[PDB]
Design a protein around this ligand. Structure first.
Ligand SMILES: Nc1ncnc2c1ncn2[C@@H]1O[C@H](CSCC[C@H](N)C(=O)O)[C@@H](O)[C@H]1O
Ligand SMILES: C[N+](C)(CCCS(=O)(=O)[O-])Cc1ccccc1
Ligand SMILES: [Zn+2]
Length: 641
């Protein structure tokens, strides 16, 4: 049900620019065939709601074969097609297109001559466009067919960016000690690693221009012509360019466009604002955004001195290299780190201001003879604790991979004999794991790799409860407490991904709305969704409010904690959602927020996902929220009152 509830179908239906341009392209394509005195037979691969096939019949198509692999959506399409009056000219086929056949016992009577698809993701080819088009041309469509879109072009732009490069590399981490400044350096293999072999998809329009320096023009790397045989074979494309500035080549930004017609008059583009002529004409969507790729190593370029950028791809994946000045399987992570820390986590560890804030917290609670246990996955806190004068430091790493990575970091920093790594689930550690000692300081960020919602990091509190018997009398916990906070917001655009459409370009899509509604209301309580709100502008309509408080210095209570209240809407706007986040009381006079950092538009901690509870799809919002200690779940309802 959750796959349906949080699918991208609703966003597509609200994507006005997408739907307008497809409709224009489809009318032109169908007319080109009819004007030749020929039968117009449409193959619509990945039909979803059936929208593009319905467009095709209004344009004059004789018949459409609409293919949809996902059974619940194929069933929806059948109903939607019927509601809109097109059942006589559209056959919905619930198969993957590569299983579709032409023949007396087949799905199609003959090859089609108009090929419509919307099989694209942010990387263009990451959801199988190439092998799908390849098979279609081989078996399902005529030579010289019309295609909508007619072609796609992938673009790339080389930049220097400390912020985005910090999602890929570990920078030196500084800490001030009694003896002076200490530095934590990365293992050399991290410095030499090509990184994780996966795109980083983001709303690139929300990255400040101050965060990167453009080093190249926007380069058209390669194009795919959907009207002719498409190949899914590996390929590489080398494009020469003259650097626009001197700097460190680090990051390749990328996006694509599609042309709906042979003449290229009708275009949809994912280019970010600085690569378009007018930011006021920018079109928002979420189902397609932009790409961030990393070069396998950084290196200098010089303004005016030509180089060649190379786009590599296989049947699903794209990656980049900078050709040698003189002068292929995709490289994989050989340093462990990129398999364990995701891109935002890299950025978080590299936030020196954040690190300094934890350092000052530790200075406050690090008493003489402190015996520290550190609990948080892949955390550098154990190293800060040592450098700041802990008598003995233990840390827990519950996976063998993370255990090895942290030991490696400790060893290259000559701390192998100062920090003991315990390879167990933290709640299961033993007296002997602590060498028979009692813990006087239990510390954490808290951060755990598996946490998906902000309150999942309350696992730290669970661990605190489980290891109580290993704590010294008067033991201190850092953070000493945590709290759940909420604010009501109006989203600029994000509301589109969960709002009903009703009518799309004249077609009745209420059945799609009903289907989504049924899935997100399956449970008695609707769940909040995690989103990185630094990528999604919104403004507050209420004051922020503390919802629940958790005293880490004490064990978790065995009864559920419930809170009820009201949040006054103090500013005008549409109440799209309640946004929730965690704050941590590190010490009596130190706090940190993983959500709102300007309690204009909201400003959000860029390292963390916030939780969004969308409201029913009016100047007070009431809430009921409950924390369940057996599971760690938090259930909630927010409603206008
Ligand atoms: N090779 C394939 N054969 C059949 N369905 C496919 C497919 N590849 C992807 N899909 C389906 O293609 C759809 C892509 S979303 C596009 C939906 C629709 N054409 C529209 O534009 O409104 C999804 O529902 C997915 O399940
Ligand atoms: C769900 N638990 C059993 C722990 C499991 C968390 S894990 O996914 O990090 O393994 C109980 C729990 C209890 C209180 C807080 C948080 C979790
Ligand atoms: Zn790596």
């Amino acid at each position: 049900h959750q796959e349906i509830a949080r699918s991208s179908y609703a966003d597509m239906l609200h994507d006005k620019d997408r739907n307008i341009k497809y409709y224009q392209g489809i009318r032109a394509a169908v007319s080109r065939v009819k004007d030749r005195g020929q039968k117009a037979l449409v193959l619509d691969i990945g039909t979803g709601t059936g929208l593009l096939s319905m467009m095709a019949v209004t344009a004059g198509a004789d018949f459409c074969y609409a293919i949809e692999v996902f059974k619940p959506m194929a069933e929806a399409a059948v109903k939607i097609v019927e509601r809109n009056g097109f059942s006589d000219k559209i056959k919905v086929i619930n198969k993957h297109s590569t299983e579709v056949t032409v023949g007396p016992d087949g799905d199609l009577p003959c090859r089609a001559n108009i090929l419509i698809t919307e099989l694209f993701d942010t990387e263009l080819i990451g959801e199988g466009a190439l092998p799908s088009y390849e098979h279609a041309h081989k078996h399902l469509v005529q030579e010289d067919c019309e295609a909508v879109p007619h072609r796609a072009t992938v673009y790339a732009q080389l930049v220097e960016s400390r912020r985005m490069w910090s999602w890929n590399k570990l920078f030196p981490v500084r800490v001030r000690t009694s003896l002076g400044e200490q530095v934590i350096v990365p293992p050399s293999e991290l410095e030499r690693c090509p990184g994780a072999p996966s795109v980083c998809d983001i709303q690139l329009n929300q990255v400040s221009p101050a965060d990167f320096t453009v080093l190249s023009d926007v380069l058209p790397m390669f194009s795919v012509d959907f009207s002719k045989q498409v190949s899914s074979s590996a390929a590489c494309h080398s494009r020469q360019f003259v650097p626009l500035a001197s700097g460190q080549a680090q990051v390749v930004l990328s996006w694509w466009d599609i042309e709906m017609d042979p003449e290229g008059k009708i275009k949809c583009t994912m280019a970010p604002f600085w690569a378009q002529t007018d930011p006021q004409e920018l079109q928002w969507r979420d189902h397609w955004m932009q790409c961030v790729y990393f070069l396998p190593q950084e290196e200098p370029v010089v303004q005016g001195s030509p180089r060649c950028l190379v786009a590599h791809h296989d049947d699903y994946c794209v990656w980049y290299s900078l050709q040698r000045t003189s002068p292929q399987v995709r490289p994989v992570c050989d340093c462990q780190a990129h398999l364990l820390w995701n891109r935002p986590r890299f950025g978080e560890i590299n936030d020196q201001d954040r690190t300094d804030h934890y350092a000052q917290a530790l200075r406050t609670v690090l008493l003489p003879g402190s015996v520290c246990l550190c609990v948080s996955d892949g955390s550098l806190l154990s190293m800060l604790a040592h450098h700041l004068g802990a008598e003995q430091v233990f840390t827990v790493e519950s996976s063998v991979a993370s255990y090895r990575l942290m030991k490696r970091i400790f060893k290259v920093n000559h701390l192998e004999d100062k920090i003991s790594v315990i390879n167990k689930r933290p709640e299961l550690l033993t007296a002997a794991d602590l060498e028979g000692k009692k813990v006087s300081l239990l510390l954490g960020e808290p951060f755990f790799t598996t946490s998906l919602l902000p309150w999942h990091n309350l696992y730290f509190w669970y661990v605190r409860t489980s290891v109580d018997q290993h704590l010294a009398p008067g033991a201190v916990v850092m953070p000493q407490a945590a709290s759940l906070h909420a604010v009501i917001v109006e989203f600029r655009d994000l509301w589109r991904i969960r709002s009903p459409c009703g009518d799309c370009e004249g077609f009745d899509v209420h059945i799609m709305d009903d289907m989504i509604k049924h899935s997100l209301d399956f449970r008695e309580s609707r769940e909040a969704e995690p989103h990185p709100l630094w990528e999604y502008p919104c403004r507050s309509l209420s004051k922020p409010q503390e919802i629940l408080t958790f005293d880490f210095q004490q064990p978790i209570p065995q009864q559920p904690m419930q809170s009820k209240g009201t949040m006054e809407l103090t500013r005008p706007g549409k109440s799209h959602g309640a946004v929730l986040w965690m704050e941590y009381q590190l010490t009596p006079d130190s706090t940190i927020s993983t959500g709102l950092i300007n309690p204009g538009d909201c400003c959000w901690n860029p390292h963390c996902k916030q939780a969004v509870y969308f409201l029913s799809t009016p100047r007070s919002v009431s809430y009921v929220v409950e924390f369940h200690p057996l599971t760690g779940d938090i259930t909630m309802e927010f409603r206008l009152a």
